[PDB]
UniProtKB/Swiss-Prot annotation, chain A:
UniProt similarity note: Belongs to the proteasome subunit S11 family.
Residues of the signal peptide: none
Name of the featured protein: 26S proteasome non-ATPase regulatory subunit 13
Domain PCI: 171-338
Organism, scientific name: Rattus norvegicus
The encoding gene: Psmd13
Molecular function in Gene Ontology: structural molecule activity
UniProt record, GO biological process: meiosis I; ubiquitin-dependent protein catabolic process
PROSITE patterns: PCI
Length: 376, 64, 195
């Protein structure tokens, strides 16, 4: 019964402030309101026991053996979790976590909570490969729930830290975007949000197949928060997407801040050019279909042999579909990629479709008069 | 409702969007058709005060 | 007792799993559901019971049958993440009681509350008006609204009796040890009508 009240009893005597916490915890168990202890315990770890007191290790044992039913499983991982964050010894912290893991009764959010904490510890040592696996496991569990909640928010922070440091821009984008997009509020500081938004913007420029530029603008994290460093940042997102070569080059100093962009330049130069072929066709075509070949080279500004590669690279990744005809020196697009979420995207579609609606009704009635006899 | 059957068949599909929560539980329509056993079909005719309006058969149906 | 359709609502919460009522509530209630079910069946056997979870997203485990086995099984497992939501259980009990396997019976709800309610003062007065118009009453064995909460129920129970042709009762089990598996002492053995 009492693993936890046994320790509490020695500890409560001597020490002002801290005595009180132990005294309250002891009384709840004895009257046997186990739930009431669960309300008390959460604060207690942050208050005595290696954050006002000592014997957190003693307490770690006590909680797990008996108290895994008595005290909420979700709360069981959570009390230790806080200590693991402040500590400078990830080697001892990782073992406590391996042990904590709950699965005791029914569904537990408890499993997901270990998966972030364990992952964060590995990144700090520099077990790079080991962090990556822990990201794959936390992701899969979460994704299965159609929702986004506080543990989901955590997943996105770990995935993004690991990815930005090694420099995997492609891998960074997906997590970073999703965090921004669902509008996470947890207990996040301003500074941490400045990091998410900033890095995602560097990451898109390097990317392949990524046309998620428009939605970023809409989202609160980028839009609400600004600074002097961000003034470069905003402008590079446009330059890259539309195809103005000159604007990006000047704003390049920005690359310096976050280490997501230091991995390559190789794809980076190709990408602005790729984006301009998709973007240009999306604006001028929508019932027209041609754009001239000629604009691409004027939004490239690089050697002629390199142009064929860029143009063909764009069809391949999935930014555009179509064919290029160089005996007319024009670009024909069969498909032009839909514009990533905006109020504007919805408006363009509605009018065209209404024009078409009128064509069906008229033509249908017309054909019905004749072959009146055939109908019967 | 509908000129045809007011019946739809739906199979629950999981897709991600980027407007709302990631991974939503939704329905993608999957094709609906009809059957009938041989006696049962003749029975369908018996209740009706017609045979059917369409079957995509000869000259006459095909236009309808 | 005689011609009654009953929905027994088992509370499954983080509150309902304590050592409040020895050995643990989960075992203790299992003894308690057998004594109320059997008690009603013993009086005259023509009553039936159903099983619903009062708490979170409602699930109908069972519709009317005499069977004790189902009540005993649901009770032992409980979600850690669960908590009571009184409004969903009353709503669902009323709706289920209408359709019946054995169909002749009057409508009475028997509910276990081993948790302080998580729903506001507007909610509790709203529910009481619904119960009264349909003339369908809830008998409550209440240790839960004692835990760190006040007894909201107490008021409803008085109002409901007299007018409705079904009875409501407030049964009080002190928080901490008093047992809640030795039900014969405080009657909710059978649901009494009002008419």
């Amino acid at each position: 019964m009492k693993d936890v009240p046994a320790f509490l009893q020695q500890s409560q005597s001597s020490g002002p402030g801290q005595a009180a916490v132990w005294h309250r915890l002891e009384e709840l168990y004895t009257k046997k309101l186990w739930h009431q202890l669960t309300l008390q315990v959460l604060d207690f770890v942050q208050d005595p026991c290696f954050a006002q007191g000592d014997g957190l290790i003693k307490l770690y044992e006590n909680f797990i053996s008996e108290f895994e039913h008595r005290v909420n499983p979700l709360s069981l991982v959570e009390i230790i979790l806080h200590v693991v964050r402040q500590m400078t010894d990830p080697n001892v912290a990782l073992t406590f976590l391996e042990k904590t893991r709950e699965k005791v009764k029914s569904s537990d959010e408890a499993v997901i909570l270990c998966k972030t904490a364990i992952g964060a510890l590995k990144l700090n040592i520099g077990d790079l490969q080991a962090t990556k696996e822990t990201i794959e496991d936390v992701e899969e569990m979460l994704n299965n729930l159609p929702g986004v909640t506080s543990v989901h928010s955590r997943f996105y922070d770990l995935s993004s830290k690991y990815y930005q440091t090694i420099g995997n821009h492609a891998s960074y984008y997906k997590d970073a975007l999703r965090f921004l997009g669902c509008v996470d509020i947890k207990d996040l500081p301003v500074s941490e949000q400045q990091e998410r938004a900033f890095t995602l913007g560097l990451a898109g420029l390097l990317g392949e197949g990524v046309f998620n530029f428009g939605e970023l603008l809409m989202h609160p994290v980028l839009e609400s928060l600004r600074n002097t460093d961000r003034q470069w940042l905003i402008d590079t997102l446009y330059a890259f997407n539309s195809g103005d070569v000159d604007r990006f080059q000047t704003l390049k100093s920005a690359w310096g801040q976050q280490p997501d962009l230091a991995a390559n330049e190789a794809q980076l130069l190709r990408k602005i050019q790729l984006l301009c072929l998709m973007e240009m066709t999306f604006t001028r075509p929508a019932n027209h279909r041609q754009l001239t070949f000629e604009e691409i080279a004027k939004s490239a500004k690089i050697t002629v042999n390199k142009v064929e590669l860029l143009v063909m690279k764009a069809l391949s990744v999935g930014l555009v579909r179509g064919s290029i005809d160089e005996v007319d020196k024009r670009v024909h697009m069969t498909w032009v990629q839909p514009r990533v979420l905006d109020l504007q995207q919805i408006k363009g579609m509605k009018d065209r479709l209404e024009l078409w609606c009128t064509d069906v009704k008229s033509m249908e009635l017309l054909v019905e008069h004749q072959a009146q006899d055939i109908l019967t | 409702k509908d000129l045809g059957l007011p019946t739809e068949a739906y199979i629950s599909v999981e897709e991600v969007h980027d407007d709302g929560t990631p991974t939503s539980k939704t329905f993608e329509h999957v094709t609906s058709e009809i059957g009938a056993e041989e006696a049962e079909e003749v029975g369908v005719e018996h209740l009706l005060r017609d045979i059917k309006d369409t079957t995509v058969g000869t000259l006459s149906q095909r236009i309808t | 007792m005689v011609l009654e359709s009953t929905m027994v609502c088992v509370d499954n919460s983080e509150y309902m799993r304590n050592g409040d009522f020895l050995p643990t509530r989960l075992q203790a209630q299992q003894d308690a559901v057998n004594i109320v079910c059997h008690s009603k069946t013993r009086s005259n056997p023509e009553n039936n019971v159903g099983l619903i979870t009062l708490a979170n997203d409602c699930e109908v485990l069972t519709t009317l049958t005499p069977d004790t086995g189902r009540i005993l099984s649901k009770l032992h497992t409980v979600q850690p993440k669960g908590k009571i939501t009184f409004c969903t259980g009353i709503r669902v009990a009323h709706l289920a009681l209408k359709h019946r396997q054995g169909k002749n019976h009057k409508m009475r709800i028997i509910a276990f509350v081993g948790s302080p309610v998580e729903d506001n003062e507007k909610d509790l007065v709203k529910l009481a008006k619904r119960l009264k118009k349909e003339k369908v009453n809830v008998d409550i064995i209440n240790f839960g609204e004692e835990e760190v909460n006040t007894e909201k129920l107490t008021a409803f129970v008085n109002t409901l009796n007299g007018k409705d042709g079904t009875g409501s009762h407030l049964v009080t089990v002190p928080p901490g040890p008093s047992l809640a598996d030795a039900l014969i002492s405080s009657p909710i053995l059978a649901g009494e009508g009002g008419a």
